[PDB]
Known about the structure:
Layout (H helix, E strand, L loop, with lengths): L1 E9 L6 E6 L4 E8 L4 H4 L7 E5 L2 E2 L5 H9 L4 E9 L4
Antiparallel strand pairs: 1-6, 2-3, 4-5, 4-6
PDB class: structural genomics
Keywords: Structural Genomics, Structural Genomics Consortium, SGC
Assembly: monomeric
Amino acid sequence: SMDSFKVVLEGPAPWGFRLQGGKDFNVPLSISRLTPGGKAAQAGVAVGDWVLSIDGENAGSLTHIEAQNKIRACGERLSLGLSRAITSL
């Protein structure tokens, strides 16, 4: 199970994260690395969060590079729809 949420980052870049995955890798796009103290980390993003949407575009329809372009070409703000595993122990 996973918990969905949204954050909006305020520019300029850099936003402070790296991606992994995408439709060309047969898996959801996710956050693989976060810059400590960077904008994404300060907004409450965590490594391993799935990326559901980028500026309204459904991330499940994007290749890895298409997702990177959507971020790089996003202008002043970056809206991310995310989901986080509920790691029930």
